[PDB]
C-alpha cells in the first residue's frame, strides 16, 4: 500500500531502518464497538483485503465460540473450500506483486487472469467480487448456485499449468535467485521470539501450521 | 519507592479534551428510568453518565 520508511545508510548498506505506519489507520476497533456483531462483520473484509473470507471465518469462529453453537457440516465444507480459494488468491497476489517489484511484471498479468476467474466465483456465490461478506457466524449466508461446483472443477483442473508457467520464469532463473537467495535470513529462535507466524516461521524450518 | 503524596486526582491536562469542553459542560449521573412501554427492569440496573444537550440544526442540503 502506502509506507513511510526512514533509514540511515552508510554507502549502499542499510545501517538502520524505521517504518512509520498509521497512514491507513481508520480506527476500526473503536468503530466496531458502536455496531452489532452482524454490523461489525463487514469490517473484517476490509482488514486484510487480499484474503477476505479468511477474516470472515476467523470472526465467525470467535463469535460462535462465545455463543456456544456450531455451523452445520455443509457450511463448514463451503467455508474451507472458499478459504482455500482465497488462499490461492492471496498467494497469487504475493508472488506476482513481489515479482513486479523486482521487475518481472509478466506473471502479474498471467496470474491476474486466474484471479479474475476466482473473482467471478466470488461474485457468483455472493454478488460481490471481493468484499463478499458471505461467511457469517451461523454459517454461509445464501448456499451455492447450481452450476458453481462444475465451474470450480473446470477452473481448478488447469491451474497447475498456470503455476507451472510461472515456475519456469522464476524458479530456475539466475536473476531471481540472485535477488532472493540469502536475503532476509531469520533464525528460528528469532522468528519465534519476534512473534512471526505463517510462512515466516515455516521458511526457517519450524514445523507449525494451525 | 513510594511518594505517599496527598492530593486529589486530576488528569485534565492529559486527556487532550479542548479547554472549552471541560469547564463548560455539565455531566449528569443517573439510573435510567424504565421505559413505560415495557414492563422489563433489566435496563435500570447500572448507572449512566451523559453530557448536556447542545444545538442541533438542519443541513441546507438534504435537510
Amino acid at each position: 500500500g502506502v509506507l513511510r520508511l526512514v533509514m540511515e545508510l552508510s554507502g549502499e548498506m542499510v545501517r538502520k531502518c524505521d517504518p512509520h505506519i498509521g497512514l491507513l489507520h481508520r480506527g476500526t476497533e473503536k468503530l466496531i464497538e458502536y455496531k452489532t456483531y452482524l454490523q461489525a462483520l463487514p469490517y473484517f473484509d476490509r482488514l486484510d483485503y487480499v484474503s477476505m473470507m479468511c477474516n470472515e471465518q476467523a470472526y465467525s469462529l470467535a463469535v460462535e465460540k462465545l455463543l456456544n453453537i456450531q455451523p452445520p457440516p455443509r457450511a463448514q465444507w463451503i467455508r474451507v473450500l472458499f478459504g482455500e480459494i482465497t488462499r490461492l488468491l492471496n498467494h497469487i497476489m504475493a508472488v506476482t506483486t513481489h515479482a513486479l517489484d523486482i521487475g518481472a511484471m509478466t506473471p502479474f498479468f498471467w496470474m491476474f487472469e486466474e484471479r479474475e476467474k476466482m473473482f467471478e466465483f466470488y461474485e457468483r456465490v455472493s454478488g460481490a467480487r471481493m468484499h463478499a461478506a458471505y461467511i457469517r457466524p451461523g454459517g454461509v449466508h445464501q448456499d451455492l448456485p447450481l452450476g458453481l461446483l462444475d465451474d470450480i472443477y473446470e477452473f481448478s483442473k488447469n491451474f497447475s499449468f498456470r503455476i507451472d508457467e510461472l515456475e519456469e520464469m522464476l524458479t530456475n532463473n539466475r536473476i531471481w535467485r540472485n535477488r532472493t537467495v540469502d536475503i532476509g535470513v531469520v533464525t528460528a529462535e528469532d522468528a519465534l521470539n519476534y512473534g512471526f507466524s505463517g510462512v515466516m516461521l515455516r521458511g526457517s524450518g519450524i514445523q507449525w501450521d494451525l | 519507592q513510594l511518594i505517599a503524596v496527598d492530593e486529589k486526582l486530576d488528569i485534565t491536562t492529559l486527556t487532550g479534551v479542548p479547554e472549552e469542553h471541560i469547564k463548560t459542560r455539565k455531566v449528569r449521573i443517573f439510573v435510567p428510568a424504565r421505559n413505560n412501554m415495557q414492563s422489563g427492569v433489566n435496563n435500570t440496573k447500572k448507572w449512566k453518565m451523559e453530557f448536556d444537550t447542545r444545538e442541533r440544526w438542519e443541513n441546507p442540503l438534504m435537510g
Binding site: G1, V2, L23, R26, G27, L31, R46, E116 | -
Partner: protein, 156 residues
Amino acid sequence: SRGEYVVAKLDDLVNWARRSSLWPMTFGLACCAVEMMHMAAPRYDMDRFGVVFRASPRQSDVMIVAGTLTNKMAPALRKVYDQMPEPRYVVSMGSCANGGGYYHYSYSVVRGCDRIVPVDIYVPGCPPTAEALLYGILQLQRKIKREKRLRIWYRR
C-alpha cells in the same frame, strides 16, 4: 468566419490529443487499488485505450485516489497533487475516497478527498468493479472532449 473555424479545428485536435493519451498516477491507499490493477489486467486492458500503467507523478495527467484518505496521509496527497503538471484531472474511486464510506464517522479519516483536492469524476462502489472504473475513465475522456479552451480565448 474563418477565425472561429480555425480555433474550432485546433481545439478539437488538442482535445483529441489530450484525451487519447491519459497517463495516470494511482494513489493505491486501500483495497480499491486491487480493482485498479484488475482494470490493467489482460481482460480489461487499460493500456489499449492509451492509458499507461503506473506513470510517474511528474508526467502524469490524471490522479486516481483509490482508498481511504486518513488525516496522517492528506498532506502527502495534497503535496503530490501540487507537483503534477497542468492540465491535471482527479478521479475519485470508491466510497472511502468519495465521502468517507464505511469510516465516515472516524477521528482519523478525511470525510472525502474533495476536501483536499478538486475532483472531476466520482466512481461509486465498495469497490467499483474494474469495468465501472473503466466506464469512469471513458466518461472523463468524454468530459475532456467537451471542453473548449481556444473558443474561450477567442471570445475573451
